[PDB]
Amino acid sequence: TQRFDFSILQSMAHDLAQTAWRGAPRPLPDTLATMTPQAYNSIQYDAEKSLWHNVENRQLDAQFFHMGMGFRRRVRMFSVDPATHLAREIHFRPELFKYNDAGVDTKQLDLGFAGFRVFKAPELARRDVVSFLGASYFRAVDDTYQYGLSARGLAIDTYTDSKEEFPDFTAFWFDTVKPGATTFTVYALLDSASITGAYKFTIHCEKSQVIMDVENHLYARKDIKQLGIAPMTSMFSCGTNERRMCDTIHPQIHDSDRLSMWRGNGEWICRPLNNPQKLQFNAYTDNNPKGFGLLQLDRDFSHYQDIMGWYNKRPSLWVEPRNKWGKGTIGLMEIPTTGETLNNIVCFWQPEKAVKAGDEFAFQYRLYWSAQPPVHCPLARVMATRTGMGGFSEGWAPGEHYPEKWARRFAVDFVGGDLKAAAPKGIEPVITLSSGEAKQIEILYIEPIDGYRIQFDWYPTSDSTDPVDMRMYLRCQGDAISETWLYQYFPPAPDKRQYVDDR
Amino acid sequence: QRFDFSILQSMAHDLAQTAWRGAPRPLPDTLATMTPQAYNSIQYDAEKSLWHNVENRQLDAQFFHMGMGFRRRVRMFSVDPATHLAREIHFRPELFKYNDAGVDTKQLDLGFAGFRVFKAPELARRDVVSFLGASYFRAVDDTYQYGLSARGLAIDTYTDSKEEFPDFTAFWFDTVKPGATTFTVYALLDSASITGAYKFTIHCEKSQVIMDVENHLYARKDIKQLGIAPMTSMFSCGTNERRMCDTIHPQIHDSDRLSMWRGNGEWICRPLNNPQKLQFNAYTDNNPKGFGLLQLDRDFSHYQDIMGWYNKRPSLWVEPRNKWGKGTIGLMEIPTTGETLNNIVCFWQPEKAVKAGDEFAFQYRLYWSAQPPVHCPLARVMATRTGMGGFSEGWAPGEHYPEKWARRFAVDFVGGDLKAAAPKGIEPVITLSSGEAKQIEILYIEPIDGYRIQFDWYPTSDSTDPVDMRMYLRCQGDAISETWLYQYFPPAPDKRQYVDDR
Ligand SMILES: OC[C@H]1O[C@@H](O[C@H]2[C@H](O[C@H]3[C@H](O[C@H]4[C@H](O[C@H]5[C@H](O[C@H]6[C@H](O[C@H]7[C@H](O[C@H]8[C@H](O[C@H]9[C@H](O[C@H]%10[C@H](O[C@H]%11[C@H](O[C@H]%12[C@H](O[C@@H]%13[C@@H](O)[C@H](O)[C@@H](CO)O[C@H]%13O)O[C@H](CO)[C@@H](O)[C@@H]%12O)O[C@H](CO)[C@@H](O)[C@@H]%11O)O[C@H](CO)[C@@H](O)[C@@H]%10O)O[C@H](CO)[C@@H](O)[C@@H]9O)O[C@H](CO)[C@@H](O)[C@@H]8O)O[C@H](CO)[C@@H](O)[C@@H]7O)O[C@H](CO)[C@@H](O)[C@@H]6O)O[C@H](CO)[C@@H](O)[C@@H]5O)O[C@H](CO)[C@@H](O)[C@@H]4O)O[C@H](CO)[C@@H](O)[C@@H]3O)O[C@H](CO)[C@@H](O)[C@@H]2O)[C@H](O)[C@@H](O)[C@@H]1O
Ligand SMILES: OC[C@H]1O[C@@H](O[C@H]2[C@H](O[C@H]3[C@H](O[C@H]4[C@H](O[C@H]5[C@H](O[C@H]6[C@H](O[C@H]7[C@H](O[C@H]8[C@H](O[C@H]9[C@H](O[C@H]%10[C@H](O[C@@H]%11[C@@H](O)[C@H](O)[C@@H](CO)O[C@H]%11O)O[C@H](CO)[C@@H](O)[C@@H]%10O)O[C@H](CO)[C@@H](O)[C@@H]9O)O[C@H](CO)[C@@H](O)[C@@H]8O)O[C@H](CO)[C@@H](O)[C@@H]7O)O[C@H](CO)[C@@H](O)[C@@H]6O)O[C@H](CO)[C@@H](O)[C@@H]5O)O[C@H](CO)[C@@H](O)[C@@H]4O)O[C@H](CO)[C@@H](O)[C@@H]3O)O[C@H](CO)[C@@H](O)[C@@H]2O)[C@H](O)[C@@H](O)[C@@H]1O
């Protein structure tokens, strides 16, 4: 046993920061390194040796992950008696696992735990609802039980003139779960070349969501180009907007469709996610952000047709800062993807002030894992962003030839708020553009969602292929009556603003 | 003045002994250059409606003005069916407003171009039946949204010479009874190669329009291709081979499939294509029971069209009223970039070569409704999906494209006896004209309580010839689904790869 609490973990992290980084894990055995995802996920932990097996009337239990594939960090695991503030280490032993000890090619296999996952009544040994695995990455599910997007303890150099640094959770301490409890507490040591951290997660496993109360203290070993707080990681391959990568049986493929920001000044932003041809970074200035999230608001199975991944059942993630974070940017990185496996969306909070060796930080935030975020704009909300050819009347698209003029059609569909009561008074879109002009601007009632479509044709004013930034909110009798739609469009090359008639 | 169906047949017979009157005179500029918007703004005088005088009428009729490509003078006659006496309704300028100034304001001899019928409570708007253009007509069910068309007749739609479009040159309307939602219109069909006498008994029912059609046809000339009970639709973008899908609309089509109930009782589901190159298929049959172009995806969210409402557009079912013998269901698919080209043609072509002097009589019923009146009692195709293969579902590589080129097919089945069949073993029976079906899976789809058949098509030949495919489900020795019939267009060999543009 040893003395353990959050204060001791902070000293540990602080003291670790004054010693040289332990460095990258040793390479795995080849049987583990070359192991397929299907083989990796078939590894069987001995349910009789579950972390909380000895707790009467337990509503939660926990098991560990084996090292394998890219998961090569030994993670040290401890049980904490919260009454006595005493931690005991749980030692890896091979007998805890089956189907871990032969490779893809049957070749027979020091090792350790790679992470943990938590199960809930009524299924204490299957269908885990929280999981920590790989670097500082974790995920949770809601009542659909379907895993989608990830969070991380921290992001470092995700978008800068040098390679991303991935911090690792190197140790977790589990408070022994109480009888009847659907909340558990886990402490984590974060360790990286640039930075150490002490984390406390108080994790609420509710009927329809997981709520994590996160507290961290960070201690910078080195100058850092980019510090990303409360990082989220998702994937967008094909949605309703700029469908360049949609050649599958699935009308849409994504773990999230949008970035949602509740700003320091009280403004709501809806930023539809892109799968761009070229790597893209955006930084959104804010001061005391109230919340931000990567949201999956299209719940319609018929929009995905995925009976393996169930994208339509995947959760939203909402970050709620528990203090004033001051000046900084919401960073959004969008990687070009051809499919599903690449985590091509990253979002984080980057404080304004440049990070120096010896800097300390303390952040508190709540994570909400659920179909809907816990808060949304009370005004009209963007339901979907659609793009395609413009330069013709809806209902009368020419079949005999392509449109004579090149333009890109935008349809932004709004629902909820006070659209019903406002419509008779007159609803106007307020559209600003970094380039081009919005023509044939229409405000059209959409009976099947009881909503309004703002449709316009973007005509280029420049041959430039620079990203085109767009903002739109609805006004009525001198008030904003919708959240702000913020879009980034990639116009084609000049010689591609025309149609090849291949028939 | 004396008129009945016997007299119409003598007229069409005698017409056929004379040379074709030829194509209509060109229109004045005012009318020739109208946009659809300007043409659809032409206003008929509702006070001069055809049955304005009929007490408690549940139907009324108005006429169309000439305009755009609607150049044929169509003569219109009122028939008292009680007395068999007909009087011509003469065209007058006074019957129309917004007909006499062009899109460029230029100020406007002429006739009627067609007719439309209105149903209580909207006797002057939102028409449910319309005859306009050549021998074309449409009807709507209880959505009241227009979609696909039918024609009286098709000639040379797909041959080594230009299509010939027969025209309806005259219509005779039985005066409607009070309370009746059925009307009778007779039509004279006139074309270079052929004349006809048509009788339509048109039932404007609560949820559908049913048309009892009888014709008598008289061939002036040899005919390379006679098309009986032709239908005409549009398929731009669906779930299958999505080459023309660059709009805000996940799908655009008036129909998604050809459904055939064959003489031997087989049900075929043939998903429609928007091919890169003009395509024709002839489906051999003998005494066909029914065939139709169906719009079975009714989900607004799958089209997002708040102008055309594709999801509200009707299916059209042809039910022969006799044994039609040997022949083919013709299907032509024209490449389209949009909505306005009627890129889908379907008709019955009798086996026997048509000769100058030949006469024919066909009886068929037309059902205009969301669903056809009959469907396969076994499992049915809900949808046909295509995309990249060569990877596992849920694990499509994002770091790179699949290493191997294959086309993935997903055929979703619903209904019949799948529930009871499932624990006994469902097997797909797949046949291909070329290539190989691999990673064949049968998968439960909880949300539609149905089964997906998924397979990856790997090519065996450099050929870019069309690849024909068939699939039906079998369980313990029995067919338990309709027959899926697909035509696939493999890319050129040096396009059987993915360019990594990022
Ligand atoms: O009994 C009961 C039951 O059972 C059953 O059975 C079944 C089962 O069930 C179960 C389940 O659950 C489970 C889960 O599962 C799930 C899955 O998952 C999976 C995953 O997936 C996913 C993914 O994601 C993930 C990840 O991964 C990834 C990676 O990542 C990484 C990172 O990355 C990063 C990056 O980095 C990179 C780089 O990149 C670069 C960059 O950087 C730059 O910028 C650029 C410029 O351009 O470039 C690029 O490229 O690179 C490099 C190379 O060089 C590398 O190295 C690196 O890495 O970056 C970026 C930026 O920043 C970012 O963003 C990213 O992130 O990184 C890190 C560090 O290093 C690491 O750590 C990581 O990992 O990546 C890779 C590459 O790229 C890729 O590929 C991958 O993918 O991972 C993470 C961590 O861990 C996580 O968080 C995530 O999530 O993907 C996607 C998206 O994208 C998504 O969506 C997915 O989801 O994956 C993994 C691996 O593989 C594994 O582990 C797993 O498993 O999935 C599926 C599909 O989707 C689903 O469905 C599921 O669900 O899992 C969990 C754990 O996690 C567990 O716990 C559970 O359990 O399911 C269900 C429902 O929910 C449940 O309930 C159950 O439980 O399942 C299975 C499947 O699995 C099957 O098999 C079976 O069957 C039965 O059936 C029944 O009956 C019963 O009842
Ligand atoms: O419901 C609710 C509401 O609404 C309304 O109502 C109303 C209505 O309205 C509606 C609208 O409608 C409109 C329409 O639309 C539609 C369309 O369709 C139609 C058509 O049109 C077309 C045309 O047609 C024609 C034909 O054609 C044919 C072809 O032929 C041609 C050629 O082609 C060629 C071929 O042949 C070959 O094979 C190839 C080789 O590759 O090539 C190609 O190219 O060409 C030539 C030149 O060069 C020419 O000439 C010819 O023509 O063929 C094919 C094959 O066979 C076939 O298929 C086709 O069909 O032809 C004939 C003979 O001549 C004629 O007659 C006709 O016309 O065409 C054109 C060109 O392309 C186009 O553009 C167009 O579009 O028409 C017909 C007759 O009339 C009919 O039936 C139909 O329908 O389209 C689409 C499809 O695609 C659809 O969807 C639509 O719908 O249009 C019209 C014109 O413009 C007008 O008038 C109308 O109005 O629509 C809208 C949108 O969608 C909707 O929404 C609505 O609804 O209407 C009615 C009437 O009809 C009335 O009554 C009503 O009222 C309102 O508002 C209310 O009321 C309601 O409630």
Numbering used by the authors:
A (entry chain B): 42 to 150, 155 to 548
B (entry chain A): 43 to 150, 155 to 548
Publication passage describing the model:
Furthermore, a reaction mechanism with an unprecedentedly long proton transfer pathway among glycoside hydrolase families is proposed for OpgD. The conformation of the region that forms the reaction pathway differs noticeably between OpgG and OpgD, which explains the observed low activity of OpgG.
The complex structure was obtained as a dimer by co-crystallizing the D388N mutant with β-1,2-glucan. The substrate binding site is formed as a cleft in the ligand-free structure, whereas this site forms a tunnel in the structure of the complex. In EcOpgD, the seventh and eleventh Glc moieties from the reducing end of Sop13 form skew boat (1S3 and 1S5, respectively) conformations, according to the puckering coordinate system of a six-membered pyranose ring, Cremer–Pople parameters. The angle formed by this water, the anomeric carbon and the glycosidic bond oxygen atom is 168.17°, which is close to 180° and suitable for the nucleophilic (in-line) attack of the anomeric carbon. The other Glc moiety with the skew boat conformation has no nucleophilic water because the O5 atom of the twelfth Glc moiety from the reducing end occupies the position for a nucleophile. These observations strongly suggest that the position of the seventh Glc moiety is subsite –1 and that EcOpgD accommodates a Sop13 molecule at subsites –7 to +6 as a Michaelis complex. D388 was identified as a general acid catalyst candidate because this acidic amino acid directly interacts with the oxygen atom of the glycosidic bond between subsites –1 and +1. No acidic residue directly interacting with the nucleophilic water is found in the complex structure, unlike canonical anomer inverting GH enzymes. Overall, a nucleophilic water is likely activated by D300 as a general base through the two water molecules (Wat2 and Wat3) and one substrate hydroxy group.
